[PDB]
Amino acid sequence: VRLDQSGTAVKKPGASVRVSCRAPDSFTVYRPRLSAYFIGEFNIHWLRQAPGQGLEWLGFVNIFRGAVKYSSRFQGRITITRDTSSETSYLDLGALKADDTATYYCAWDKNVDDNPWRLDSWGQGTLVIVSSASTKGPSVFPLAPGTAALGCLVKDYFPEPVTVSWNSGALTSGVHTFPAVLQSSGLYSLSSVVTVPSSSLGTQTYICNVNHKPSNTKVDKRVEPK
Amino acid sequence: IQVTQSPSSLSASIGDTITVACEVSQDVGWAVNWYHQRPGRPPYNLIYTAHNLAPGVASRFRGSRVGTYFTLTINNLLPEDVGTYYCQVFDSFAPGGTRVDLRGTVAAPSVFIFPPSDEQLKSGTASVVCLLNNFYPREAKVQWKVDNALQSGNSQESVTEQDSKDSTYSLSSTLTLSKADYEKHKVYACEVTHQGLSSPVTKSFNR
């Protein structure tokens, strides 16, 4: 089944988030005796994955009457509901912690007794970011240079993501843009590098194009040998 | 119910047969499900109830049960099989999954070191960056030294996904120092250990 989720949420610790999941045309089942489609008995599950980690189950709602089961790790700050007219489930997670930062997934369960907890379809995920930090654009520093390496250090921004291209996208061979790391400051940092012929360093211009959409920050940083 | 998977990671050549195991702390009948997650994608269901292939999953995947010991076997491994495999019992997932990548040619990293920029230094903080380029396997060790003193706790590192054409990885490590500390020392070095190196490689500069 097709599952559509709401967009990225950025929250302060202690705040609440509502993540939405819609399953268009999947809540009902044709029932010959009624000669019509009627609400089924499916489960919609909510799970999450923190950066670099495995999967964690949070809870489910049964769509027939809204019965729920929740992980005891979240009891007291989690509610899962469903709206049968819009074929949507809501995950409400309250009192948010920094370690609630994760991609949240809804997943579909046909609720067949012979196949327990089969999560047969998954949403694309919703990024939920929980931090004390405020939106901040990066500072972009050069990593200055047979083969030479050069790059850009994209430091101290919030939240994710940053994108980087080289020479407005004309330079792609040899480019590596690394995953960001979350620094102890609560701000992110990443590096992008490219390997080029050493003989080109004085003649070809190299510009890293850094884009940080959350702060409307665009930087085109010329990287010259020191 | 505790669920454990092994190995945590494995490398395989195209065409190989590989096996991932999922051990459950008590009898749960056949109620183990398997999921595959490609890099940057959502998980999807691979096998359900120990041995049933999910719709559209290739027959070279096989799930089996021996008591509390469950296996996922992948025959004729293909590049599309790269990613992480997760097993599930009811509400329990294992910690960590099993990361599968392709076995490339063993290749030592090309190493580069970058001093902090003077523009950064005006801010009171210094970042030193060490690049390990185009190496295989993914396991690598970076040790920072400052005037020959082994650094600990003040670096972070990040690794690319496996390259689609040459199966290599790259790694970037950042050493973070105060400006005051940076200017008290002369020799900044990153020492790299890797299977493709007979002895560690050190790249350095003098401030």
Residue numbers in the entry:
A (entry chain H): 2 to 35, 35A, 35B, 35C, 35D, 35E, 35F, 35G, ...
B (entry chain L): 2 to 91, 96 to 212
Task: Copy the relevant paper text.
Broadly neutralizing antibodies (bnAbs), capable of neutralizing diverse HIV-1 strains and subtypes, represent promising tools for immunotherapy and prevention. bnAbs target conserved epitopes on the HIV-1 Env trimer, including the CD4 binding site (CD4bs), glycan-dependent sites at the V3 base and V2 region, the gp120–gp41 interface, the membrane-proximal external region, the fusion peptide and the silent face. The highly conserved CD4bs is critical for virus engagement of host cells. To elucidate mechanisms of Env recognition, we determined single-particle cryo-electron microscopy (cryo-EM) structures of a BG505SOSIP.664 trimer unbound (2.9 Å) and in complex with representative Fabs from each expanded B cell clone: 04_A06 (3.8 Å), 01_D03 (3.2 Å) and 05_B08 (3.3 Å).
From 831 expressed monoclonal antibodies, we identified 04_A06, a VH1-2-encoded broadly neutralizing antibody to the CD4 binding site with remarkable breadth and potency against multiclade pseudovirus panels (geometric mean half-maximal inhibitory concentration = 0.059 µg ml−1, breadth = 98.5%, 332 strains). 04_A06 contains an 11-amino-acid insertion in the framework region heavy chain 1 (FWRH1) that contacts highly conserved Env residues (>99%), providing a structural explanation for its remarkable antiviral activity. To determine whether the conformation of the extended CDRH1 of 04_A06 is preorganized for binding, we solved a 1.75-Å crystal structure of unbound 04_A06 Fab. In addition, an unliganded 04_A06 Fab structure showed that its FWRH1 insertion is preorganized for binding, despite potential flexibility arising from it extending away from the antibody combining site, suggesting no entropic penalties for reorganizing the FWRH1 insertion after Env binding.
